[PDB]
Structures are given as C-alpha cells and as structure tokens.
Amino acid sequence: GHMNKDNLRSPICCILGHVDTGKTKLLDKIRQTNVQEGEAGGITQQIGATYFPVEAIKQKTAVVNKDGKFEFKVPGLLIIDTPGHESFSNLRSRGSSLCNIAILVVDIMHGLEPQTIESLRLLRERKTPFVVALNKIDRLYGWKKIENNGFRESFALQNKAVQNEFRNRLDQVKLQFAEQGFNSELFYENKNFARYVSLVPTSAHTGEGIPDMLKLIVQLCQERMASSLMYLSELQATVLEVKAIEGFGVTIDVILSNGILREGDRIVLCGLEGPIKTNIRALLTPAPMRELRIKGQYIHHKEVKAAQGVKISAPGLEGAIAGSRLLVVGPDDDEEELEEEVESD
Ligand SMILES: Nc1nc2c(ncn2[C@@H]2O[C@H](COP(=O)(O)OP(=O)(O)OP(O)(O)=S)[C@@H](O)[C@H]2O)c(=O)[nH]1
Ligand SMILES: [Mg+2]
Ligand code: NA
Q1: Is the CB of residue 148 less than 8 Å from the CB of residue 30?
Q2: Beta-carbon neighbour count of residue 258 at 10 Å?
Q3: Which of the chain's ends, N or C, has fewer CB atoms near its CB within 10 Å?
Q4: Domains plus CATH for the chain?
Q5: How many Å apart are CA 76 and CA 57, to the nearest integer?
Q6: What residue owns the CA closest to ligand 1's atom 12?
Q7: Sheet holding 184-186, edge to edge
Q8: CA 156 to centroid of ligand 2, rounded, Å
Q9: Which pairing describes strands 308-313 and 249-258: parallel, antiparallel, or unpaired?
C-alpha cells in the first residue's frame, strides 16, 4: 500500500565526468542559469544539487515527445553536479553514493579520459543505471545548429562532412567503452538499454540533444532503477557543506535522499565537538531549478519530501561535518542511541 501515486519519491541523478567536459554547462542550459561563468577558474569545487519538478521536465522534453504519448511517472528529479578535477575523487565518490541513476559526460572530441574511467568504476560498483552524454557536438566542423533541438532532428540537417566526422568520433568512443568492457550504442540505435550503454550526443552550448538526454534519464528512473526507489521509505539524509548565510546563521546544506524532513524536526548529525543535537528552525530550498551550492533566495517549507537539496537553519551547527549522515529523532527513538549511530559509520 506504499507503492502508489500517493507516495512517490523524486529520484537522484548524478552527473559525472572528466574535467571540463561540460557537466556544469549542461546543467546551466537546462536551468537557464550561468553558474559556470561564476566559478573561479571555471572549476566546480563542491557537490551541487538542482531540483527539477516533473512539469519542467515535460516542457523541456516536448520536442522529443511531440505527440505527448510518453508517460511521466516521477514527480521530479534532483540532479547532482560533481567536480571533474582530478583532486576531488572524494566528492565524486560522495555524489555517486547518493545517486540512483547517472549521466556520464564524455567530450566527443576527446573520448574517455582518466576521470571518465574513475566515474565508470564508481557507477559499475553500485550498479547505477546510466547513460552517456557525448557532449560538445557543436565542435564538429561545420555543425549547423537549431537551439534546444532534439538530436535526431538536428543531425538530419547536417552536411556529409559533419556526418562522417560524427561517425568516426562515435566509433572511436564505442571502441574505448568496449576496451573497458561496456557495450554502447547511439541511443536510437540501441536494441537494449541494459545490454548496452546508451550514448546521447549533446551540446551544452546550443542545447541540442539535451531533450533526448532528459527523456532518457526519466526512462532510467522508471524502467531501470529499482522500483522501490520510485516511492518514499525511511528517512535518509547527508550533510554536504556548512555555510554561514546572512539572516540564518551557520546553516547546513543537505541532500535528503529518502523520506520526509519537517520544520521543527529534532536532528542529530556528526560535529567536531561531538554529536550535534538540534531542531530545524527553517527548512529551505532554493527556487526550483536553481543550485543549492550558489547563494540565492530561498523558499521556506513546513515539510520537504525526498529527494531534495535543502538548507537547514538551526542552532549549534558550527562544527557540522560534511559527509555526515543526518537522522531525525522520532517519538520512540533514544537520542543518545542516534548519536552513537551517526558517529559509527
Ligand atoms: N563548444 C562547446 N563548449 C562547451 C560545451 N559544454 C561545455 N563547454 C565548455 O567547456 C568548458 C568547461 O565547461 P564546464 O561546464 O566547466 O565543464 P565541467 O565538466 O563542469 O568542468 P569541471 O566541474 O569538471 S572543472 C567551458 O568553457 C564550457 O563553455 C559544448 O557543448 N560545446
Ligand atoms: Mg563543473
Ligand atoms: Na570546468
């Protein structure tokens, strides 16, 4: 009686890939933001999270669902951005641990690179369903764009030189995946999603292929991800970062992976001075489709259902530890037991 339309969960998708492959730029094109331009050195140094309500995903896939026949079943999707720079393997591992499905970004002009291989191992270890965004197609020489088009509609319009270049680069990337033990196919040439990795060509600059990628991730959620993860179960939450925010004191940014968090909840998490026990005074999200990791305006909530990226204002968070689990003390819980439990992992 819990696997039904009244208990749906928004799943979590991680975007992984080698440095400078376009992971942040793809998310900026989806959000209609400019986070990448605001990063020092254009380098992502923190895990990001953006929530997409299913209404926005429907709109942003309309050009590859013109007849309206694709059935959306998820309520929304939380997408996690991760660093590609070699020095952030800990945050790729943390992000991957949180996700239920993933996009692996490959620059079509460079193929598989060391952090591509690292990310592929993280996904395989957790049996995470994924597709590959073969990004930067606009760098094919003579590429002719239509902004935000479906990949097939745009590829049909390309000259013979571009089609040959695309095919050569696609074949090279397929060979590299096979050398790593993965069979792969262009996503409309793929007979089986499970058997072979789907490859979806994209441009974060023109937006082409992004509708196809969004449709594919929704299909991964509804068709490949364990069905139990489409529905809410016990609370799971993880601290990402500790940030002082004007008006809200020292706050924490948290991925709520499962269950429901409520304003007023008694929470326990790891701290530098020992376990922190406190009460949520404000339970915040960014606006839809805006990054948790960028300071902005916030929406206040009495409750937030998973999965979401939230900011919590509460007394006593100064020494909160990134990576900590976060537990909610229920009526029959022993608070000291919960303390021992967050510090045990
Ligand atoms: N031509 C072209 N350039 C792109 C595309 N996607 C990203 N870029 C460019 O590549 C550079 C890196 O993009 P960025 O979004 O920072 O990658 P990233 O994967 O997030 O990088 P990081 O967090 O691992 S350091 C930027 O200059 C961006 O404009 C694309 O589709 N086409
Ligand atoms: Mg980035
Ligand atoms: Na970058």
Answers
A1: no
A2: 18
A3: N
A4: 1-232 (3.40.50.300), 233-345 (2.40.30.10)
A5: 8
A6: 20
A7: 48-53, 76-81, 12-17, 101-107, 130-135, 197-201, 184-186
A8: 30
A9: antiparallel
Q: Please, which residues have CB less than 5 A from ligand 3, an ion?
A: 20, 42
Sequence positions preceding breaks in the chain, C–N over 2.5 Å? none
Instruction: Report whether residue 145 contacts ligand 1, using a CB cutoff of 6 Å.
Output: no
Amino acid at residue number 86: E
Q: Tell whether ligand 1 has an atom less than 6 A from the beta carbon of residue 293.
A: no
Distance CA 40, CA 250 (A): 23
Which residue has 């193929």 as its token pair? 111
Structural tokens at position 70: 């694709």
How far, in Å, CA of 90 to CA of 7, rounded?
33
Contact 118, 147 (CB under 8 A): no
252, two tokens: 């924490």
Ligand 1 centroid from CA 33, angstroms: 14
* Reported resolution, Å: 1.5
